[PDB]
Design a protein. Structure first.
Lengths: 353, 55, 220, 278, 51, 74, 188
């Protein structure tokens, strides 16, 4: 009964209007602060005595009065898409074992990614500067977002998710300044890891001068490239990138410094195909007879994806046979045939480097 | 005579230069001026409302 | 012991006073979540959050008033009335017009009985669409991953559109038509937020079915 | 009243008390391009008088090109150890706002605090983003920012005569740059970073290897031999990839194994099967 | 043109002479309109002499 | 063709529903429409004038009850 | 001048009618309907508002994405307005007036017979096919040497009886800044 009156008394405090945000450009005096609103207009105001004048500093997010237009309260930093870049989730861990190959790539990115974090000493002794970047590309094969995804959910620490389609921004390519601010919050939560999916479009060449989109895209690219040309230490931030074709990425990204490492996925060997087939035979209930070398002999040149879809094709073809446990003869039939249909639709899998 | 000293007050002294977007049979015409300003204006004066045409 | 009804009278009178601040949660606004406490210069504690506007502007307010930061992570659409700069109610959901509702299908009258000669490939289709609906328990028994994308190709006709939309009317589940070139837009990457909104309302209406044609128009 | 001046707005100046990174002793390749940077930067910076005496007018316009390899911004990082002056570090894109009217305030402030701090130096990295022709009003705000390029261009005629500014600039592609800038009278200096040669090879090998623990087995001559037949590069970060094939281990003092294996690691693309023309 | 005192003009001109002069058209009639406003006038071809 | 008049007077009469004046209009257009048998032209080409027309058309100017049918002699 | 005299003399009643319904700025489409009374709305002012309607409008007349009039201060929906379109391009294509009647055909009969009964007969006598239905075909095609193309179209204009038809030239579809002709063809 009385708790309600507590809420209603809270409304009495809600009779106070929200204040207006702004930035601190400079300060002319103690009663003259050169400020700007997030909406563009600039102002000069004094302020009350609850501030610490030195704490103010230029380039400071503050809140202003609705009439006096002066600082009462302030907050250091804010960013909307960040927590959503941190909200990615992936199972595994164990999937890092489930992927099969590729071993030397797995351990390679484990070293150049994880090792600068935990052991800067090994690097600083030999005199070598740690690589700040890496590149992945399929689908000559596939497993990019899988592997790197299980590295994000594997190493944990701090990690940032980026799809290349969120930098679109429509008017005023300030998704550029979202790359700047995003890198600043990567300097906040550092050490951090950066995903980059589908980097071809946000990596284009501006070969032929044309239209508008290509130009402002190239502008955000200038932001990227010059923030990897620092003027800044990116040691503590990691960047992982995946795209179809390593062709349109321009020599600026192809240049070390900005992009130190280059690693690819290749079509899985019948050994790795064997292994991933093993881990894909686990969840599916099977008949007592199992022979993997049948499918390994028959299946050649598939993606790892095409192979797991081949296993699912076996089982979902086996829902017609209505058997709970299913023989691998039905798997040889449906796997073989429908797999070869995938290979008839496998047109133009041959990509540049 | 008196009409010249009348309609000028209503339209005076300042008036914006607008652009006719489309016409509704109410004599209300959806209009457009910088920026994104639509509206309904029913007037019988100076018109010529047939020959206006959008744009 | 009867004074509890007196406080009841004042909480209802204040609720009536809340109604005048509840009319209307006019302006739509975007949120940036924050929980902050400001020491001085003696002490002031609580929660304070950041807010955008429909007019692209941004404010900073002591936490609403009515509902608390229980909702949400930085959201939007929170209803706030003009100069109040306080949110009486947090409203959903999402957006937007043509993008929100591209298609809402009652049902086309035709069914698979109107076509013939496809019994094998319509067995494959009726498989891929029907087996997650009713037979999901069979999958969890066998440990099966159902299919998602299913490619449909051939020169008209065929008549694969009457196939997909007929059996789509036989699904009774939520169904959204879509045209391929619709994703071509006026500004950079509008089609992106378009498709994300599509799959968001699809995930809301789950299970559902979305049919697109002329993918090769936008898939070059 | 007006700005004090100059109290900004934005940017701001400095950040160069916590910077630059390392001194010009890093790179030893150029020795000529660095001399044009020398006479075109800090010979005018120390003497405005000797020019009027000898009767030759020094331009403030500086333009660098040729990448990759990098060069470029490392000459600025090295200039901040050379010189004590003003330093403007602005990404060519960084200033594009929601309101076109913010551009002129930003760049105008840049120039009035530049001449306020004169002797001064201003650097904009890759204006190629803002150097292309465009019409439509949406990007027409950016047509107002190339009108801003012409604004600050008129102001770059306004620094003359004498005191002062140094406008240095670089780009990854200079094709689309509209000639009004480069055309004589404003930016008069065209600098081109050359691909490293045998001098630049040996100098870059020595300077990068001086910062790593190296074995007495490792030879620099064979790698100014076979990679010099093709590369090219970026040679620096390729030796860094050698120390990084040492950082593949668990390694003590790097061997020619990780060197040669890093030169074949990054990179060789062979042309051609069809090369039998020759 | 300096000793003749007639106003001196070089042809396109980029990019931004399409801005100041006219909107979009053949545009040499609008440039020719400027040359009609200021007469006598010299039009130079700048430069398009290149390899 | 008479079908188009049939469709216009057929669709406009769907309203009101009666509103018997619609069953008055459907015959109204076909007075002159299906009357025929006389061409005018003007009346007339010889420069006389129709006497029933001016007469009758002067009364319904304040049209009230049966004056419209008196004029409907036409 | 007399017509302009009476034209300018109606402003006295016009200003009395000018006080009400003027607030119609601006046209606005809704986005969702929160509850029974309340509708969230977006206006090209780019501000967005949740509000009711002017109670003379029946609340069941509103649909999602419906351009509706407004009282700007209350922001309430004033009147639902049907048109959401159109850029002048389509009404530029909207066609009127006949010319070049049938007998202007140059003796082509089977052609003119088929391309005639395919449009007139279903449109002139719809009940006939509904009786025999079946169905008349969706559309037709013409082509050949220039003589005579597009002129039999003019004949379709002449013999056209009641419902107007919209001519569409070929080039107005293609425009630069891609995605324009799409909106075009869709909205037409
Ligand atoms: N080596 C692998 N081990 C396990 N699963 C794999 C492997 N390679 C691909 N897959 C399967 O492929 C699917 C997609 O993951 P992946 O990151 O390969 O997509 P992708 O590489 O972006 O595809 P594409 O390159 O064809 O666009 C996953 O469901 C995954 O199970
Ligand atoms: N095998 C068939 N069975 C039943 N109907 C058919 C068959 N082939 C063609 N049709 C008929 O042809 C008509 C035209 O359909 P059409 O072939 O254009 O559809 P579609 O090709 O699937 O659509 P789209 O052209 O977008 O691919 C349909 O009304 C359909 O009834
Ligand atoms: N002696 C040298 N010769 C060439 N490059 C070097 C030398 N020493 C260091 N570098 C490279 O220069 C890079 C930094 O240069 P900078 O920041 O100027 O890039 P940039 O010139 O903007 O890039 P780019 O010119 O490729 O677009 C370092 O990553 C380093 O690998
Ligand atoms: N068979 C015909 N009957 C009547 N008139 C004809 C015939 N052939 C040509 N003409 C006359 O010749 C003129 C030119 O033909 P028209 O321009 O209509 O064809 P077209 O428009 O060139 O065809 P297309 O649209 O394929 O270019 C027309 O004005 C028409 O009156």
């Amino acid at each position: 009964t009385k708790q309600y009156e507590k809420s209603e008394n809270d409304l009495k405090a809600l009779q106070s209007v929200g204040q207006i945000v702004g930035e601190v450009l400079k300060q002319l005096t103690e009663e003259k602060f050169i400020v700007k609103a997030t909406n563009g207009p600039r102002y000069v105001v004094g302020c009350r005595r609850q501030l610490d004048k030195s704490k103010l500093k230029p380039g400071t997010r503050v809140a202003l009065d609705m009439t006096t237009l002066t600082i009462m309260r302030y907050l250091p930093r804010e960013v909307d898409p960040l927590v959503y870049n941190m909200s990615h989730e992936d199972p595994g861990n164990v999937s890092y074992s489930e992927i099969g190959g590729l071993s030397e790539q797995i351990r390679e990115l484990r070293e150049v990614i994880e090792l600068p974090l935990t052991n800067p000493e090994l690097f600083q002794r030999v005199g070598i500067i740690p690589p700040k970047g890496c590149l992945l590309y399929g689908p000559p094969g596939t497993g990019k977002t899988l592997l790197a995804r299980a590295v994000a959910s594997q190493l944990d620490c701090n990690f940032l998710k980026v799809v290349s389609s969120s930098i679109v921004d429509k008017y005023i390519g300030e998704s550029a300044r979202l790359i700047r601010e995003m890198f600043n919050y990567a300097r906040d939560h550092q050490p951090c890891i950066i995903f980059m999916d589908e980097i071809d479009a946000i990596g284009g060449r501006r070969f032929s001068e044309g239209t508008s989109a290509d130009r402002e895209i190239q502008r955000t690219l200038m932001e990227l490239l010059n923030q990897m040309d620092g003027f800044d230490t990116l040691h503590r931030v990691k960047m992982i990138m995946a795209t179809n074709r390593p062709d349109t990425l321009d020599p600026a990204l192809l240049r070390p410094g900005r992009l130190d490492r280059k690693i690819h996925i290749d079509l899985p060997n019948e050994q790795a195909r064997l292994d991933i087939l093993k881990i894909h035979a686990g969840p599916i209930t099977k008949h007592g007879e199992i022979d993997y070398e049948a499918i390994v002999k028959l299946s050649d040149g598939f993606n790892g994806a095409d192979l797991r879809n081949v296993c699912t094709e076996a089982g979902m073809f086996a829902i017609r046979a209505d058997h709970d446990f299913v023989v691998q003869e039905d798997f040889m039939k449906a796997v073989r045939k429908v797999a070869d249909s995938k290979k008839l639709e496998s047109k133009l899998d041959y990509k540049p480097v | 005579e008196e009409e010249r000293s009348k309609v000028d007050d209503l339209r005076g002294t300042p008036m914006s230069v607008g652009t006719l977007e489309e016409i509704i049979d109410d004599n209300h015409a959806i209009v457009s001026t910088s920026v994104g300003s639509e509206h309904y204006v029913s007037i019988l004066s100076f018109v010529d409302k047939d020959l206006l045409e959008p744009g | 012991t009867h004074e509890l009804q007196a406080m009841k009278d004042k909480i209802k009178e204040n609720s009536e006073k809340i109604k005048v601040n509840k009319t209307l949660p006019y302006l739509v606004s975007n949120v940036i979540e924050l929980l902050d406490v400001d020491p001085n210069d003696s002490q002031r504690k609580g929660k304070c959050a950041v807010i955008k506007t429909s007019t692209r502007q941004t404010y900073f307010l002591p936490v609403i008033g009515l509902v608390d930061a229980e909702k949400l992570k930085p959201g939007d659409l929170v209803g706030v009335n003009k100069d109040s700069y306080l949110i009486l109610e947090t409203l959903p959901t999402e957006y937007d017009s043509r993008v929100k509702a591209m298609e809402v299908d009652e049902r086309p009258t035709e069914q698979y009985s109107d076509i013939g000669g496809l019994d094998k490939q319509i067995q494959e289709l009726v498989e891929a669409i029907v087996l997650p609906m009713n037979h999901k328990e069979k999958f969890e028994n066998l440990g099966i991953q159902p299919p998602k994308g299913v490619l449909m190709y051939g020169p008209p006709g065929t008549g694969k559109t009457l196939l997909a939309r007929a059996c789509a009317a036989q699904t009774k589940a939520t169904f959204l038509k879509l045209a391929g070139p619709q994703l071509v837009q006026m500004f950079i990457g509008d089609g992106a937020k378009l498709v994300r909104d599509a799959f968001a309302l699809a995930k809301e209406k789950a299970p559902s079915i979305i049919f697109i044609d002329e993918l090769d128009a936008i898939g070059t | 009243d007006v700005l004090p001046p100059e109290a900004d707005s934005s940017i701001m100046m400095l950040t160069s008390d916590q910077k630059p990174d390392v001194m010009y002793a890093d790179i030893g390749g150029m020795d000529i391009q660095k001399q044009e940077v020398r006479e075109a930067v800090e010979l005018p910076l120390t003497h405005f008088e000797l020019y009027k005496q000898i009767g030759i007018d020094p331009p403030r316009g500086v333009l660098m090109y040729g990448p990759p390899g990098c060069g470029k911004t490392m000459l600025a990082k090295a200039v901040a150890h050379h010189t004590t002056a003003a330093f403007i570090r602005v990404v060519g894109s960084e200033f594009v706002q929601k309101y076109l009217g913010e551009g002129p305030r930003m760049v105008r402030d840049v120039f009035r605090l530049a001449k306020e701090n004169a002797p001064a130096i201003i650097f904009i990295d890759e204006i190629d983003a803002i150097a292309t022709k465009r019409f439509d009003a949406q990007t027409g705000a950016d047509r107002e920012v190339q009108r801003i390029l012409l604004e600050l261009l008129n102001q770059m005629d306004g620094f003359d005569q004498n005191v002062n500014v140094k406008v240095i600039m670089a780009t990854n592609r200079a094709d689309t740059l509209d000639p009004a800038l480069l055309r004589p009278g404003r930016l008069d200096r065209k600098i081109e970073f050359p691909l490293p040669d045998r001098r630049q090879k040996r100098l870059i090998f020595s300077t990068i290897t001086s910062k790593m623990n190296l074995s007495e087995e490792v030879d620099l001559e064979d790698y100014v031999a076979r990679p010099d037949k093709i590369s090219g590069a970026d040679i620096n970060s390729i030796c860094q990839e050698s120390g990084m094939l040492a950082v593949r281990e668990n390694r003590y003092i790097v061997l020619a194994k990780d060197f040669e294996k890093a030169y074949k690691t990054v990179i060789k693309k062979d042309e051609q099967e069809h090369e039998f023309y020759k | 043109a300096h000793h003749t005192d007639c106003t001196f003009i070089r042809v396109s001109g980029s990019e931004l002479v399409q801005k100041f002069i006219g909107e979009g058209a053949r545009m040499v009639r609008e440039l020719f309109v400027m040359a009609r406003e200021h007469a006598p006038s010299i039009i130079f071809m700048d430069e398009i002499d290149s390899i | 063709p008479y079908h188009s008049d049939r469709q216009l007077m057929s669709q406009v009469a769907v309203a009101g529903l009666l509103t018997v004046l619609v069953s008055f209009l459907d015959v109204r257009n076909i007075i002159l429409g299906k009357s025929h048998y006389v061409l005018y032209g003007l009346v007339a080409a010889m420069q006389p004038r129709m006497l029933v027309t001016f007469d009758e058309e002067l009364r319904p100017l304040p049209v009230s009850v049966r004056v419209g049918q008196a004029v409907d002699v036409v | 001048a007399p017509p302009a005299l009476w034209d300018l003399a109606a402003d006295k009643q016009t200003l009395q009618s000018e006080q009400p319904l003027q607030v119609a700025r601006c046209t606005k489409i809704i986005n969702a309907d929160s509850e029974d009374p309340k509708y969230i709305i977006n206006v090209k002012q780019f501000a967005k508002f949740v509000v009711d309607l002017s109670d003379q409008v029946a609340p069941t007349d509103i649909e999602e994405g419906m351009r509706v009039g407004v009282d700007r201060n209350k922001y309430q929906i004033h009147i639902p307005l049907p048109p959401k379109i159109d850029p002048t391009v389509t009404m530029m294509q909207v066609e009127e007036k006949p010319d070049v009647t049938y007998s202007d055909v140059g003796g082509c009969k089977e052609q003119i017979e088929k391309l005639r009964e395919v449009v007139e007969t279903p449109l002139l006598h719809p009940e006939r096919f509904v009786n025999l239905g079946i169905e008349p075909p969706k559309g037709v095609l013409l082509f050949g040497p220039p003589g005579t193309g597009k002129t039999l179209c003019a004949r379709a204009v002449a013999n056209r009886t009641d419902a107007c038809f919209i001519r569409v030239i070929g080039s107005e579809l293609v425009q630069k800044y891609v995605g324009e002709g799409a909106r075009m063809v869709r909205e037409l």
